[PDB]
Amino acid sequence: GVVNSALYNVDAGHRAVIFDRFRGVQDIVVGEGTHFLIPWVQKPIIFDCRSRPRNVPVITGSKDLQNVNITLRILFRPVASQLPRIFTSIGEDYDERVLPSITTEILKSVVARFDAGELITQRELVSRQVSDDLTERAATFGLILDDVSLTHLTFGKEFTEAVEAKQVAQQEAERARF
Amino acid sequence: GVVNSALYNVDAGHRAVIFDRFRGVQDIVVGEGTHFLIPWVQKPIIFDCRSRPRNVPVITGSKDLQNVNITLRILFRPVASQLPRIFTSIGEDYDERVLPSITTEILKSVVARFDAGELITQRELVSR
Amino acid sequence: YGVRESVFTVEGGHRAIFFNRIGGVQQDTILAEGLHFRIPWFQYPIIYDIRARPRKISSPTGSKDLQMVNISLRVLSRPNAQELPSMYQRLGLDYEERVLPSIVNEVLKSVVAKFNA
Amino acid sequence: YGVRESVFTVEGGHRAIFFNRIGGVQQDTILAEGLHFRIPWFQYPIIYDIRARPRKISSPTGSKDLQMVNISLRVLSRPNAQELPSMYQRLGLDYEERVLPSIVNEVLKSVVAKFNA
């Protein structure tokens, strides 16, 4: 460029990835050392990535075909040098319109392992299960999986009906008693 | 007032924690007096220790209560000697960040300790 | 500022201190109206003679399960001839809405908790 | 001006990773509370307001039952000053708000599912 012509000045922590428009995109892992910047837009673009959250639920049936929706608080930190190595596809901020597919596949396989109620009474179990599935697929994306939360459970109006009716049964026990 | 500046004219509670600029806090905290505060060896970080009556309401239940409405008035000051620490760990605030931490947690557990009629019975012992 | 802050004759007989906080001894005394004069900047004006203001404080309360009843307790709040030396440092501002509400209300709770009336 | 170009003074409750972006790496130079060296031309402060910062987070949570209920926590928090560069390399200077909804939504939900809350 101008102020960074022969220089780059590696933005460690902000990971400005150089996109060698002169040759398409960089085949060099940025920023592993000061890189020469060709005036034909061979230039760094900040992809800090950095807390990248995506709190997305997926509509899916359950073990008893119940409308379960869990907002997976997806959080990615793309692997420092691997995202630059992903220059054959997405060297930029890894496209967050592609990543939700991790949940549309995994969370659909995760729901119906517990049918809703089992998760309600046993969170940690399925939470670890989904975090492991997500970690494997995060490796397939070349990303570091941060703490992904299994939260904001929507599960079934038949179950909320059943639990309010369970309390109604107890209320009727005492009401008829008195 | 012209003399009000420079010379720290001050009444009850306005603890200008005296800092240098900046390696740490000066040996003294002053809020009732009148002396010079040059903000290089004397930065006037005023915490108004004047007591703070905060009547914080809590809607909760108990061992068997579902709807009980309990309001708690806490009159308080901050500890002058700990204001330097507060300043670096909380800032100029000595409340509002931590005011709920000295109302809500305590009352939720205290009311859970008591029950229907024992809140009423104990009164000052609930407050105890 | 200075001139009026130093004037302490003033028609009347009111109890108020011009307290020299830089050396805290004076605190337990007052200036009586009819004096003159004191240091405008180092000494600070605190009202000791507070008139008998009829403050009504009211509170519902019960006992065990006894219905909540509202005690109406009015306080005349007599002058503080020698009580402000501590009250101003503690409260400073008018106690009527700072500590007096608790001084009345907490007692009222004890009252009906006993069952009266 | 030149003073700010060579040093930076924090009265309290704030840190800053003086990270050299231009010609070298200096991220270890964490602003000690007070006066500390940094050159903005090359060394860029990543400022963290490490004071007791509240945040009330509310969410429906599970239980040893089918019932979910809204439980809330006023998250008081301080970023770990002495490990700011580490998190800066991982999550950066906004994690203090972005990581918490991944934290509390399982702190609560785990604990409350283990109990009948």
Q: How far apart are CA A168 and CA D64, in angstroms?
A: 18
Q: Are B124 and C109 in contact (CB under 8 A)?
A: yes
Which residues of chain B make contact with C109, given a CB cutoff of 8 A? 123-124
- Paired sense of beta strands B54-60 and B43-48, if any: unpaired
Q: How far apart are CA C5 and CA B1, in angstroms?
A: 12
End-to-end CA distance of chain D: 57
Q: Would you give the distance in Å from CA B115 to the centre of its chain?
A: 30
- What is the three-class DSSP state of A60? strand
Q: How far apart are CA B47 and CA B31, in angstroms?
A: 8
Q: Which is nearest to C32 in space by CA: C60, C11, C55?
A: C11
Burial label for A123, CB within 10 Å (0-12, 13-18, 19+), is: buried
Q: Which of B35, B53, B120 sits opposite C98 (nearest CB)?
A: B53
Residues 6+ apart with CB under 8 A from A38: A20, A22
Q: Using CB atoms, list chains with 3+ pairs below 8 Å to chain B.
A: C, D
Interchain contact, D33 vs B91, CB within 8 Å: no
Min distance A172 CA to chain D CA atoms (Å) = 18
Q: How far apart are CA D15 and CA B93, in angstroms?
A: 18
Q: Which of B21, B24, B97 sits opposite D9 (nearest CB)?
A: B21
Q: How far apart are CA A69 and CA A62, in angstroms?
A: 10
Q: How far apart are CA D92 and CA D20, in angstroms?
A: 15
Q: Are C30 and C16 in contact (CB under 8 A)?
A: yes
Interchain contact, B89 vs D78, CB within 8 Å: yes
Extract the tokens encoding B92.
Answer: 């100029």
- What is the three-class DSSP state of A151? strand
- Token pair 């005036």 is found at A39
CB-based contact (8 Å) between D4 and chain B? Answer: no
Interchain contact, A149 vs D59, CB within 8 Å: no
Extract the tokens encoding B87.
Answer: 């300043």
Extract the tokens encoding B6.
Answer: 């420079």
Q: Are B100 and D54 in contact (CB under 8 A)?
A: yes
What are phi and psi for residue C104, nearest 5 degrees?
-85, -55
- What is the three-class DSSP state of A30? coil
- Token pair 């840190």 is found at D15
- Interface probe with D: pick from A151, A158, A167, most Cβ of D within 10 Å: A151
Interchain contact, D13 vs B98, CB within 8 Å: no
CB-based contact (8 Å) between D36 and chain B? Answer: no
Interchain contact, C93 vs B50, CB within 8 Å: yes
Residues 6+ apart with CB under 8 A from D116: D63, D64, D65
Q: How far apart are CA A22 and CA A41, in angstroms?
A: 6
Q: What is the CA radius of gyration of chain C?
A: 19
Cα–Cα distances (Å) from A125 to A57, A106, A122, B113, in that order, read 19, 15, 6, 32
Interchain contact, B3 vs C2, CB within 8 Å: yes
Which residues of chain B make contact with D10, given a CB cutoff of 8 A? 22
In chain D, which residues are followed by a C-to-N distance beyond 2.5 Å, i.e. a gap?
A: none
- What torsion do the CA atoms of D56, D57, D63, D66 make, to the nearest 10 degrees? 130
